[PDB]
Every structure is written in C-alpha cells, then in structure tokens.
C-alpha cells in the first residue's frame, strides 16, 4: 500500500560521488558517497574496478566494516569544527601581542620566560581548549617557526606524517612546507616496525610484494602471523576462493585467530619462536630437495639467483675458524682483471675450478656500464660460465668453523635447548694465495648454510643431525622443544610446501605480517621464511614468494610524488630523519635502557670493540654517515656560511675542519644541552602522541613536559653505566617541545595534548589520490561536499601557513645559506663507502671524508620570503637537473611543458613562468605527469636509463603502454591500472599478475645487494659480530620491565606477569574509527584486553572485569575479555584503542589510565644502524632502527577502586579476589 513509499523515499538521493579512505589499512577501496540535501548520508562500495583476467576473481566490492562507518564522523559529536588553542596560551599570546606588534617578538617574550612557557606546557592534556580563528593560529604558528629557525635552526622545526600512499597530496602539503624552510621530515615505516630489515638485507629493497590477486595463482599458502580476514579484509576473498581451485592453506598462530577459521590446518607455536620452526622446515627442505634427491629446478635457481656460490674468507681463531667477509676480486693477483671497484665485486668458482667475478655484483653498478645484470657470465672475459655451489669433493682440506648458537639463552618464560654457545662444524675449504702473497682458506655461502642448518654431509660432524629426531641445531625434534609444535607436523608441511614448489616451479607462497615482524628479532623470523622460499625457487615466480603485508607502504607513483613532497623541484637535498632513533633520543627513552649491546654480540666477537650504551652505536653511525641526524649540528646551520667566509674558507671545508677539531659538534652528542632538541612539531594524518608512539609516558614527560606514569628508575638511579658518546644528566631536560600543532577531523588523543588544533577536511570533503600494495589501481578521494564548518584540506592549511610565514619572516630571514648533512644513500654511487671493514674518523682511524666515512655536507640556498611562491609552483630543478629514483635518472622536460598547459603558469614574482600548484588537483596532476607508472612516456625513458646499467633492453616492458597518460579526472570516472616501471620488480601485464622479484628473475636485473643476488650471507663487520651473518634462532629479549615493580603497589589482588602482544584490532584501523560509535557498539564499548581462561582464573578475573596492566614503563586500565582461544602465558590488547574513551583512573599512577603503549619503550638494535655498505646504506623509510614491541612483558591484576577522576559521584568498587 501507499505507506511503502516511506522506505523508498529514504533511499532516494541527490547524487553519488566517488571517494576513498585516507587511512593506513592497505585497503585502498573506492566508494560511492551518497548526498541528500547537501549532506553525506551513507556509502556503499564502487564495483566498477577494471576486471582481472577471466581466470581470476575480480576485486569488487572490496571495503570493510570500518570504512563503511566513516560517514559517522562527518557530523558526529567528536568532529573538529574550528581552530582551537589552549586557553592559557591564547591569553599570553594576546597579552604579548599588545606589547609587541611583531609576532616573532611576541612569541619570543613568551617562550623565553621560563614561567610563561611552563604555564601552557603543563596544561597539555588538561582541558581548557578555546575557539580561535585561522588568522590567529596562522600568525602564531608562523611566528614560532621564524623564531625557532632564526635562533636555533631550521632543523629544530619538525613534522610527523606517515603513509603518503593513503593520501599523497595531503602528506605532501606539510612535507613541502617543512622541506622548503629546512625543517625535519620524520620517517614512519621503520618507526612503526613495518619495515622488515630482512628485506633490505636480502634484496636491497625496502619492500616489494605480490598483489593479492596473485595469491590466486598460488597452489600452496601458509598464513604466518598474518590475520588475513581481519587485517586484510577487502582482499580476504582471494584467499578463501583460491581454496576452491585446490590450493592448500595453513595458518600459523599461537591463538585460534580468525585466519585459522579459513585454513586446512592450524599450527600453534609459542609466540615469538617462529624462527625456530622455520629453521627446522628449511632443514628438511635442504635434506630432501637439495641433498638427498636434488631438484633440478631448485638447484638451478639457487645457483643463478642467490649468493650461495660466493666465497667467504675464514678468520683464524683459537683452535677453529670464524666465517669472515666475502672474498673480493681485489684480494687476488691482478684483481681478477677488474680495474673498476674490484673491492666491491664478489667471487665464486666456475664449474671448472677457476675463479671468476660474476656479472652483477654491486661493483659493476657504478663506474662502468653493461655488466650489472644476472646473466651467468665471467665479469672479465664476458664468456658464459656455470657457478659451482659446493666445494665438497674438490676441497684442499677440512676446517672447523664456529657458528653462534643462542637457542639456549632464552628467558624463563620460553622453552630453551642447551647445546654450546659456539657450534663447531666441518667445512670443505680451498687454500688460496692472495695478492699480498699470504694464504687464506675459503668456503662457499652454500656449505656454510648447509652447515648452519646442521646437515651431515659425509664428514664426522658431531654437531650435525643423524636423523630429524636427533636434537641438534635446527632439526624438527629441536624445533619441537622450542616451539611446542609436533616434529611430524613440521616435517609434513615442509615436504608438501617444497614438493608443491618443485612440481609447479615455485608456486608456494607465505603471507606474513606484524605477528612476526613486530618482535625484537624480526630479522630472524623473516630470514627464516625467506630462506624456505628461496630454497624452493618461489621468489620472482607468479603464485609464489614472500607476501609481506603491513601498512599502506607502497605509493606506486613514487618518483612523481617525491619531488612534490620534499620540494626537490626547488631545492636538494631535504632533511629526512629516521624516527625510531629520533624519539629514542629526544623522548629520552635511552635514559631508561636496560638492554646492552654486549648481550647481543656473537660469542666470537671482540667485546672490547663494542662497548658503550646502545645510543652510542647510533651516535657513531651518524658521524660515519650511516644514519641521518636531527637536529644535525650543535650549532645553527644557517650561521655556518658566514663564519666560513670570515675564515676565508668555503662552507664545506670550514665545516669539515670544525668537525675535525671539535669547534662544531653533531647535536646527538649533547641532546639535553638546551639547543639540540626539536622545538616545534607538526602532527597530521597521525595519532602519534596517543597510540603510535611507543613509550607513551616518556613522550609525555620529556617531549610535552606534562604529568606521566613512568614507574621505574633511570640509568643514574640504578648506578648503571652511562653512554661513552653522549653527555649525562641526573635530571633530564623535560618539556622540550615549545609548540605542538595537530591537524585532524576528530578530537584524538594527540589533539587532546596539543597546544593548537586545526580542523581538517574529511576524506569526503577533499581531492587527493591513493594507491596500495594490494592492487594496481590508482583512484581518488573527492569532495562530495565542501569542507564542513571551518575545516580546510591539509593542502590548503599548509598553503595558508606558508603564505603567512612568507610575510612574518621579512626582516628576520632573507636569502639564507644552509649547511645540510646527508647520510650515505643506498642507490647512489656513494653506497660503495667502506668495503672491507669499519673505520671511525672521530677515533682517528681514517680521515673525515664527506660521503664516504662521514655524511655528505651540502649547501642549500633558501629564499624564505619566497616560501609561499615556491610552495605554489613547480620548481626549475626538474628541468635543470631532471628526475629519478632507485639509482636511475632521466630528462623530464616534456612533462614540464605539459604541466604548464594543464596547471597554467605564474604570471609574475619569483616563480614567473613555472607551472602553478594552487590546488590539490594541480598537485595531483604533477604527480601523475611526472611518475613513470602513470605516464607511459616517462616509463620508457626510465626503463631506458636502467638499460644502460644492465646492458639489456628493458624498454619493451613499457613500449606498448607509451602514449598512456593517467589524468586526475579520468580516475574519478574509473580507477586505472598503473604502468610497469623500473621503480618496482613486479609487472602490470595482461597475462601475468603483479609478482615481486619478477623482473630480477625474468629480466635478469640484479637485486641491489653486494653480490647482486638474494643475499643469504651478511658479511658486514657489525652483522658478523652481532651474530647475524647467517640465519639463527634468537629467543625473545628480556626488557627487564617487571621485576622492579611487581608487588610494589599492591591493591590486595593477585598479580601475574604475562607476555603483552598487541595485534591489530577488528574495530578500527589503528586508532582511527576507535571512537566511532558503530565500531564501539560492535566491539565491547571501549578499551579491552584478552586473557586466557587459565590466567584469568589464576587472577580471579571474570569476563568484563576492570583490570590494570603495568610495568616499569607505565600503566593502563581496561576491561577483560576472557577467552579459550587465547593460550595461557600471553595476553592480547588489540592495537589501536586510544586514551579518549571509557577509561577510568589508574590505581598505580593515580592519573587517567594509560594506553597499550604506556607499557612499552623503545630499544634499538645495532644491526639496523648499519650504513655505507651497498644494500646496507640509508634510505628514507628504507633502513634504520625499528620500533619492535612484542617482546614486552607486563603485570596484570583485577582492579579494586574504579575512580573516574571527573568530579561526579559515580565511582565503583570491585569485590575482592580472595
């Protein structure tokens, strides 16, 4: 009847607009945004993606429950509508302004007054926000920036924003402003611990993985520490559907996770011990498919694509030998006929016993052309050769080599197997007379590997296995004791996996994630899985390989976006910084370090050469140009040029001289001296101070200068030993940040602790672009409605700040000269820095040579009053120098000519005649036109540049797509697939899906490693001395965070120490959506923690009881979720719950309960600090220390008093435990 028209009317709408989500999920899903009466009402997925091959499932509809709830945010009660400022700060700002008409002077009068400063800094996170205006906040922000740059330096200003792929222009907005003024741009991939150091170590690549549709081409898949249905939702169907094609799937998780539901088998190893299982599996694979019944496919594969045939020099020790660095052409007489970089070319024996320097080692990459390829050819004669794998059978003798074993150094919480700290093995060796006349013994990476796995080969090695049941280093029986997983399961799966790979030539795949990558020894977890895939020739074959998925790390049109984001079109270089080191330093988490480098060393290392605090290793790496610094120098870099002049020297020589004598020092040596810490911080597209940042309480104490919940004592208080490179103070400097500016659309935890909050446009109110690792489409974010209330897009917000800055700086900053340090970069000729060992110029072991034994020292001219005009225009450097990345470069004049027609040009001023960058769409068109993956004309030029290096034609990969040009307005009509480009190793082809390593294997392009092949052996001095030259099991570390505080503040209830894991949640993407009512209603209405039934019973905890979790780092409050699916001994607080909703007071700190990162703290690893060594050289987000976190242990107990600390008389009391 007529009443039916009611529901019909509800569905009717005014229009649908296409947009996506700028959140770090990797989803990259296109949606239909419905508008009714000028308001967004709901969204449903777009289904018009270009379809995949008929034999593969299509992508539609993608989507997930979080994204489906985004519309809730637009007019919600938590929406940020106007610029906000802390009341106390606004009061002082206005009083000061009445005294000083110049805002810079105004700011000065405030921040130079200890009492005034302390006044608003202590108000952080304590209410009092007041509505301001754009004009007011823009002037204050600009004045602060000018004051900081002028009195301390450009690099005392910084910005944090991650994952540019989820919203490219939005990321670029702030990064471009900062890069122009010289501020610091902080990294995120390493900081978040999504970067797997094992990737750069093995392939010389940040991360390149198969697309999800490629899982469908696989016939055997293991989901290892990856909760696919929950953390890869829009792609999960490829996994569920491929099972119908006959593909067997295996889930490896300690708990019964959602992924288990989808597999044919569930294996539950003890969390953190996965490397042990991987080792035993590789052991079985080597025994049966390489040794006992040699696989034709596997053998040929490892011979041509790995460093297994490469020779390693043995170091003579007391009674035995230690594996040293890899033999180089320069070690032999006449350097094997290599005049160019002979010290960077590895060596192997051909199948005729002759030595040869094979094509492809990193030495052939620079200084010459045409031999940097994986053709099996003699690098001297050019003739084809066949490399020899094993020396067994042609050895001159047998040596006993020592291998480090840590499988017995576990903590009391994990099972261990005692053997010997050093295991001696029988190795076939050859005697060589080096160029200096001396003799050396060598062996291949191949037998060192077989030895390390404990495989008996006909010698009488007592440390090798006589059976899989023999408890020896890395046998199933050994792994069974360490992991708890049945030895027969380990054996059966290793066989099926390898057998499947042999029958299909590599179509076996391992999907892995943060479950394994967030452990301190993520390096070993990954190298374990990687070795299995390599032994089976899976890497580089469609349907096979290393499928690492974490955040939305892959911004496909990389070289088009880089120049925009870091203003490389106007000035080079910018100031990049690796965040883990940055925060370990400035939030002073190093002052509480409990882990020593000494306990990480290989038993065969010279302890005396590795003394000092972990932070000393970082400072040393920085001075050697291995890692970046921020702030860089202990003096304002804008004042160095004027002194070099007074001293009749050029800026660079003056700086090098000063560093040598000590008149100028690296700021990292004296971090608390009052001039070497960041003072201004911009935060956007991030909830750092409230969820991302590990060591939450330390950040509150040292960065913000506010109340905190740290429970333990620092270094001085425990009589511990201090740093040898950094000064020490019993009372660390607190409240370092003078101003914290956060841009968001919802009032997050970070916002709650900022000084100024800027309202930004939601994803449905602005234009931008988005790409992902999961699929090959680039699509847009669009404005279905104009920004609500007083919100503005990130691009417009930073543009306005830039415009105001250009005005406020006049008279304070003009055309300045800046001295910028730049670490030795991977993918640059300088990557061939220190070939044979490590020398520290500061220790007088070599001279300070910029770009080789020290960072590069660069001169950058900055026209401060022209900041806005440069921001809003594409610079002349693209036409003068060119564009490029990943080691190649090309001319891009044709793209600039086109951009002048699409964006129009400046009619006057400093950038007269340059293409304009007024709108977000102008910036998007710049990215699309410049990138090889979106402009076929550039793709061909890029492939041609690479062809010069390899000597092989690669242009055929993009020639058939030359002429294709992706335009912003076209992707609004339909998402488009990108173009095959040299920036990536997978292909965009009609017949084969995108599979990483495909071009290396099929086009014979070398991996960017020392040997040019997949690097199984790491020969850098530090890798060797820290025991990681080869894969070895390393148990979870002891953070020593419980012992000192357990039982110290009893509340009467039973306490217990448990392993604190933080896998990503089902009701949000990180903290985004965490405050969204739809997600809160489908979850449990706020912060909760999962506990096994056993542990819960022991603690007298019932489902949903209020509990407290803490350790020396801090404390958090939450409700419990008691479940059978959680194994005893571990607790899970799904990552992303924040500090703004449903949290009562803490009984441990008497403050608002903390977050999951209140109980964690940064602890770096020296091997992640290595630089100046081919594949181990710096790159923004490419290498650097990571924010590992799964090793953490905490104290858990039922809460007693539930106080909300809010003033109402609504507090509760939970009945005792008894």
């Amino acid at each position: 009847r007529d009443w039916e028209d009611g529901y019909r009317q509800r569905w009717q709408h005014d229009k649908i607009v296409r947009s996506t989500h700028g959140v770090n999920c990797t989803g990259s899903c296109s949606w239909k945004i419905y508008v009714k009466n000028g308001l967004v009402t709901w969204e449903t997925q777009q289904t018009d993606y270009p379809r995949t091959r008929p034999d593969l499932p299509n992508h539609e509809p993608r989507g997930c429950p979080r994204g489906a709830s985004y519309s809730w945010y637009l007019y919600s009660a938590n929406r940020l509508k106007y610029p906000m400022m802390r009341k106390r700060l606004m009061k002082m700002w206005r009083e000061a302004k009445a005294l000083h008409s110049d805002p810079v002077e105004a700011w000065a009068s405030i921040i130079e007054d200890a009492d005034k400063a302390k006044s608003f800094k202590q108000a952080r996170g304590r209410g009092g926000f007041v509505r301001s205006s754009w004009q007011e906040v823009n002037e204050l922000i600009a004045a602060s920036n000018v004051y900081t740059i002028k009195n301390y330096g450009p690099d005392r200003v910084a910005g944090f924003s991650p994952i540019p792929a989820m919203s490219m222009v939005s990321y670029a907005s702030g990064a471009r402003y900062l890069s122009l003024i010289g501020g610091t741009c902080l990294s995120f991939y390493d900081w978040y611990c999504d970067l797997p150091p094992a990737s750069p170590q093995t392939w010389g690549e940040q991360t390149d993985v198969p697309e999800s549709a490629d899982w469908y081409n696989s016939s055997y898949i293991i989901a290892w520490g990856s909760n696919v249905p929950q953390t890869r939702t829009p792609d999960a169907h490829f996994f569920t559907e491929v099972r119908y094609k006959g593909t067997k799937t295996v889930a490896v998780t300690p708990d019964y996770a959602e992924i288990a539901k989808l597999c044919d088998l569930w294996l539950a190893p003890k969390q953190g011990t996965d490397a042990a299982m991987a080792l035993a599996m590789g052991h079985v694979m080597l025994r049966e498919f390489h040794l006992d019944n040699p696989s034709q496919y596997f053998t040929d594969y490892v011979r041509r694509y790995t460093d297994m045939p490469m020779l390693v020099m043995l170091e003579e020790r007391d009674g035995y030998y230690a594996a040293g660095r890899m033999l180089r052409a320069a070690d032999l007489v006449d350097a094997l006929g290599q005049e160019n970089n002979p010290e960077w070319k590895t060596v192997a024996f051909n199948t005729n016993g002759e030595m040869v320097a094979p094509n492809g080692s990193i030495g052939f990459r620079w200084g010459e052309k045409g031999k940097w390829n994986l053709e099996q050819r003699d690098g001297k004669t050019g003739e084809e050769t066949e490399l020899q794998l094993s020396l067994l059978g042609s050895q001159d003798e047998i040596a006993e080599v020592g291998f480090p074993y840590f499988g017995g150094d576990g903590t009391e919480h994990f099972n261990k197997v005692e053997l010997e700290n050093v295991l001696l093995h029988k190795l076939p060796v050859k005697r060589l007379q080096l160029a200096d006349g001396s003799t050396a013994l060598v062996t291949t990476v191949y037998d060192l590997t077989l030895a390390n796995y404990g495989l008996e080969r006909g010698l009488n090695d007592v440390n090798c296995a006589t059976s899989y049941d023999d408890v020896k280093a890395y046998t199933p029986a050994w792994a069974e004791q360490i992991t708890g997983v049945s030895r027969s399961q380990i054996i059966r799966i290793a066989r099926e996996f390898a057998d499947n790979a042999d029958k299909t030539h590599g179509r076996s795949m391992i999907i892995v994630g943060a479950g394994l990558n967030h452990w301190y020894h993520l390096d070993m977890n990954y190298r374990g899985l990687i070795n299995m895939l390599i032994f089976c020739g899976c890497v580089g074959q469609s349907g096979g390989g290393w499928a690492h998925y974490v955040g939305q790390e892959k911004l496909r049109p990389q070289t088009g976006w880089q120049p925009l984001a870091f203003a490389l079109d106007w000035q080079r270089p910018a100031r990049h910084m690796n965040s883990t080191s940055y925060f370990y330093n400035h939030s002073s988490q190093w002052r509480y370090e409990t882990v020593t480098a000494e306990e990480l060393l290989s038993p065969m290392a010279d302890k005396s050469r590795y003394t000092g605090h972990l932070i000393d290793f970082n400072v040393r790496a920085e001075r050697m140009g291995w890692l970046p610094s921020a702030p860089q120098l202990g003096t304002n870099p804008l004042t160095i040029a004027g002194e070099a002049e007074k001293a009749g020297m050029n800026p660079v020589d003056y700086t090098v001289k000063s560093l040598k004598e000590g008149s100028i020092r690296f700021a990292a040596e004296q971090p608390e001296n009052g001039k070497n810490h960041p003072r201004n911080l911009f935060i956007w597209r991030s909830n750092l101070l409230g969820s991302s940042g590990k060591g939450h309480e330390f950040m509150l104490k040292y960065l913000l200068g506010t109340e905190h919940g740290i429970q333990g004592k620092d270094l001085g208080q425990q009589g511990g030993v201090k740093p040898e490179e950094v000064d020490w103070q019993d009372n660390g400097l607190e409240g370092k940040l003078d101003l914290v500016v956060t841009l968001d659309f919802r009032l997050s935890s970070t916002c709650l602790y900022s000084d100024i909050i800027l309202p930004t446009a939601t994803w449905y109110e602005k234009d931008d672009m988005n790409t992902s690792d999961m699929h090959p489409f680039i699509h847009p974010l669009s404005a279905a409605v104009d920004p609500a209330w007083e919100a503005k897009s990130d691009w417009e917000i930073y543009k306005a700040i830039a415009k105001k800055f250009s005005e406020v700086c006049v008279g304070h900053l003009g055309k300045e000269t800046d001295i910028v340090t730049l670490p030795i970069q991977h993918d640059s000729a300088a990557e061939l820095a220190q070939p044979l060992d490590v020398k520290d110029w500061k220790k007088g072991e070599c001279d300070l040579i910029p770009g080789k034994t020290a960072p590069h020292i660069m001169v950058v001219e900055r026209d401060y009053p022209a900041t806005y005009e440069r921001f809003t225009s594409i610079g002349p450097l693209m036409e003068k120098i060119g564009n490029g990345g990943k080691g190649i470069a090309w001319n891009t004049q044709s793209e600039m000519d086109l951009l002048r027609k699409l964006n129009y040009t400046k009619a006057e001023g400093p950038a007269k005649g340059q293409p304009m960058l007024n709108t977000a769409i102008d910036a998007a068109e710049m990215i699309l036109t410049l990138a090889p993956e979106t402009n076929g004309q550039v793709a061909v030029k890029a492939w041609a540049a690479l062809s010069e290096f390899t000597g092989r034609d690669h242009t055929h990969l993009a020639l058939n797509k030359e002429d294709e040009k992706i335009r912003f307005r076209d992707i609004q009509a339909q998402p488009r697939k990108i173009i095959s480009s040299p920036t990536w190793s997978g292909l965009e082809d009609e017949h084969v899906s995108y599979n990483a390593g495909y071009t290396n294997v099929h086009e014979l392009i070398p991996w960017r490693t020392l040997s040019g092949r997949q690097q199984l052996y790491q020969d850098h001095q530090w890798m060797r001395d820290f025991g990681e030259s080869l894969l070895v099991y390393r148990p979870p570390i002891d953070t020593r965070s419980v012992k000192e505080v357990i039982g110290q503040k009893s509340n009467g209830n039973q306490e217990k120490a448990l392993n604190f894991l933080t896998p990503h949640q089902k009701w949000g993407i990180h903290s985004t959506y965490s405050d969204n009512l739809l997600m809160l209603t489908l979850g449990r209405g706020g912060p909760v923690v999962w506990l096994s039934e056993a542990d819960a019973k022991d603690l007298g905890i019932a489902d949903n009881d209020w509990i407290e979790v803490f350790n020396s780092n801090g404390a958090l409050t939450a409700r419990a979720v008691v479940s059978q699916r959680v194994p005893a001994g571990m607790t899970m607080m799904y990552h992303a719950q924040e500090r703004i909703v449903n949290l009562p007071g803490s009984e441990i700190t008497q403050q608002r309960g903390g977050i999951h990162n209140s109980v964690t703290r940064i602890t770096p690893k020296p091997t992640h600090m290595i630089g100046g060594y081919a594949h181990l050289a710096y790159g923004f987000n490419y290498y650097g220390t990571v924010g590992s976190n799964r090793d953490e242990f905490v104290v858990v107990r039922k809460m007693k008093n539930i106080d909300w600390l809010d003033g109402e008389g609504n507090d509760q009391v939970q009945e005792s435990v008894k």
Partner: protein, 465 residues
C-alpha cells in the same frame, strides 16, 4: 495452484570472514534512527554462542515458530487465535532490553569542553541512548560474544550444542568458531504474519517480501514472540515494530540488497525461485521434522519446464522474471548441487535465506597423519567442526545433507587441484559424491570466480504495470 516468485538468498558460510560490513551498511541506510538504534536487521553472530537477542534459538523460552498439533494442523507455538488476542494485554515472553543490550553513546564533547585546570585528563564516558543517563559500565552489546569472547562453558550454552558431548570442545586444542550472518528469512509460511491478528504484517505477492504495515501496526507485539528468528524489533520511540525489508526499493529496480552488494567476502547470492503458493501449507505440516528440508525443495519449480513456464505466465509472472529464474544461482545451489541448506527448518516457516556450511581446519592430533582420500587436502571426516553441530543449525539434526554439502565442496577442491597442479583429470572425488565434471566446473565458476553478474541475478519488477 498459484505460481509465485521470490528472490531467494544464499550465504556461503565457508567464505564468510565475519567482518560485519553487511551489518554496518544496513544500519547506516535503514536503522540509524532513535527507536531502532539497538536493532540490527542484519546481524552477525560468532558460534558457538547464544546470539542476539540472547538465546533466540531457544523456542521453549521465547515461544517462537509453529508446532504441529496431533491432528496434523499447524498452530503458532505461542497459542491459538484466542490466546494470541489475549496476549495483546499480557505477553510474558517478550525479549527484554537486557536480552538485546542497552544502546549507548559517549560524552565526546567533554573532550572539547573540559575546563582549564582540570585535575585529570578529560575522558568520554558512556551514556544511555534510552534514558540519557550516565552509565557506570557497559555490560552488553549486540556482538558481545565476537570471536569466542567469554568463558566457553557460557558460550557452550548454545542451543546447537544440544545432544552433543561438549567436554572435549572446552579444550584449547579443539577450539573452533564460525560466523552466522542473518537477516529476516522472508519465509513462505511466516509465523509473524500468523501472529498479528490485524493483518498488519503481510507477504507481498509479487516478490514474497514480508513487511509490517506501519499505519496498521498498533504495537501489540505478538509478532516479536512469533518470529522464531527474532528478526522483528520493537521501535520504542514510534511504538511500532520494524524488520528487514529485503531492500525492496532496490529489488523492485533489479538491484541487489544493500547487504548483498556490500558483502566484502562475496558470499551472498541472489536469484529468483518459482513456487506453488498452494503447496506451502501441506509441506510445512509434514509429520517428521527432518522432512521439512526436502519438502521445501519440493515446492520450488523447474523454471525450464514448459508447463511451469506456461502456468507462471498465466498466473501473472512476467517473462523476464521467469528467464531470471532460469539463470538463478540460488536454484543451482539449493536444488542442483545441494550445497545450500535452510536455517532451522524445524520451526516450520520454510525460510528463504539459505546457507552453505563452512569447512574448517582438520582436527588437532600432534600425529601429523598421512595422505587421505583427498590427498594432502582434507577428508570430510577430519574437519574440526562437529557436523552434528551444523546439523542442529541447518537440518533439524540430520547430518546427511550437511555431510553431502561439505563433501561436495571438498571434492571440487580435489578435482581442481589435480587439474591446476598435476595437469591431469582426476574425477574420483566427484564420482564419490555424485557430481560430473560439468557440475564441478560450474560450481567453481559460481563459488570461486564469482563474477558480479553471477552472484546477483535480480530482474526488475516491471513498475510500469
């Protein structure tokens, strides 16, 4: 004899990942209103569990569905006509708010307006959407048991664990969990229609969609008790009841329901089914509970039979609807391959939203075992999910139809692996389950590739008439 058409729906639970996207999109479009904020027309429950409202499958408790009188005739379990009208005044079985959950919100504004000099960090506390008062603690939600959240012995009170020796499943190594997304079944013998004396509830003749006339509803609520799936919710603000409307505004235009098109897992299929409306009473009245499944299959007509077509046209079914029925993916799954099964057929409503049971990891053992009938792939007997459990859920306790569905999907996998990995034709598994290569290939086409045009085959309703 009266031929009717209805768009049936099949959810492949083997592919469900329990994401709840389906629940969010339905909520956004149809129930984001005061009065039904607590109602989820489409909701997903993790099993083992008691669900939403709590223990809804317990008819002895809620009195839903039909019962068969000793005289062979059907009567609502909640009473005859007389008793029903009496329950307009007193109905002691209605689901209480605690059986669902007290809907809540949070004081987000406190984060914005917290005054200067606050003694602690401002926080957003919960507040009831019903009373508007502060809530000291959230104790319930519509999805509280998600992913086995709660002590097992409490979750195990699941009605489907009836007649099953539970003990062993209360052990870590034997853990199992599945997801049950569900909406209104738009039944052929709706108990809701029979429990509302005024006739405010009706099943549309053109498409079988069951709706509650908002003008006619008086809030008597016997229908809430009557529906054994508890899919009718009281709108406390309007004083009327509401339920899933099968997105008729979209179905009438030849589009999928919102929850089907937005299903991230691509597990939902929509297709036309023709049936003899005059054969429903007899089928729902069959004596043995375990015959209800087959009796319902018997009312579905063959859209390709010339007489059926002829009769359909005479009864007013547009030719385009009949042609859609001939391409129905739902017919193939329910009638031909026998993969889809009804949800609780014993309630006697002849539900129209069917389910394909899920496969699961093999049972835990430690003894890695050896190859089986299906090689490295599982054999139906080794699946960790107790088949009796799936039987109580989908076939009134009869494991035979469930084992057949599961066994047929496994056979497809075995056949396809031989083809794609060994490059050979092996039909042993197919022969063992009564399927031909042609069938296995079409199953693969619809279940694995699942192109959009194959998942939804919905004809428009010819509104010009």
């Amino acid at each position: 004899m009266k031929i009717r058409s209805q768009v049936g729906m099949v959810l492949n639970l083997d592919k469900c990942i329990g994401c709840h996207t389906c629940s969010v999109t339905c909520k956004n479009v149809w129930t984001s209103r005061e009065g039904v904020e607590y109602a989820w027309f489409n909701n997903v429950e993790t099993k083992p569990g008691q669900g939403f409202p709590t223990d809804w499958e317990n008819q002895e408790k809620y009195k839903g569905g039909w019962i068969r009188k000793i005289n062979g005739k059907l009567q609502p379990r909640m009473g005859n006509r007389a008793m029903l009208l009496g329950k307009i005044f007193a109905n002691p079985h209605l689901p209480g708010i605690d059986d669902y959950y007290e809907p809540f919100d949070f004081d987000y504004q406190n984060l914005h307006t917290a005054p200067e000099g606050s003694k602690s960090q401002p926080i957003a506390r919960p507040r009831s959407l019903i009373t508007g008062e502060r809530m000291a603690k959230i104790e319930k939600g519509p999805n509280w048991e998600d992913d086995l959240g709660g002590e097992f012995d409490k979750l195990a009170k699941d009605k489907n664990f009836d007649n099953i020796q539970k003990a062993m499943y209360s052990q870590f190594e034997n853990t199992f969990m599945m997801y049950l997304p569900r909406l209104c079944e738009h039944c052929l013998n709706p108990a809701c229609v029979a429990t509302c004396p005024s006739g405010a509830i009706y099943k549309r003749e053109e498409d079988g969609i069951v709706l509650i006339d908002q003008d006619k509803c008086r809030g008597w609520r016997m229908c809430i008790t009557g529906c054994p799936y508890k899919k009718i919710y009281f709108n406390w603000k309007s004083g009327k009841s509401e339920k899933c409307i099968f997105c008729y505004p979209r179905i009438e235009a030849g589009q999928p329901t919102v929850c089907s098109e937005t299903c991230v897992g691509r597990i939902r299929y929509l297709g036309v089914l023709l049936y003899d409306a005059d054969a429903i009473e007899r089928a729902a009245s069959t004596e043995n509970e375990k015959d209800l499944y087959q009796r319902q299959l018997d009312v579905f007509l063959d859209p390709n039979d010339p007489k059926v077509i002829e009769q359909a046209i005479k009864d007013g079914i547009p030719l385009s609807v009949i042609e859609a029925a001939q391409q129905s993916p739902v017919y193939k799954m329910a009638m031909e391959w026998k993969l889809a099964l009804p949800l609780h057929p014993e309630y006697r409503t002849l539900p129209m939203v069917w389910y394909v049971p899920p496969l699961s990891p093999i049972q835990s053992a430690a003894d890695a075992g050896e190859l089986g009938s299906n090689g490295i792939l599982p054999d139906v007997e080794s699946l960790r999910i107790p088949v009796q459990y799936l039987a109580n859920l989908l076939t009134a306790g009869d494991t035979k139809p469930v084992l057949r569905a599961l066994k047929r999907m496994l056979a497809m996998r075995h056949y396809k692996r031989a083809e794609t990995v060994d490059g050979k034709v092996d039909t042993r598994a197919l022969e063992e389950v009564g399927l031909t290569e042609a069938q296995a290939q079409e199953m693969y086409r619809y279940l694995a590739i699942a192109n959009y045009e194959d998942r939804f085959v919905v004809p428009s309703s010819h509104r010009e008439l």
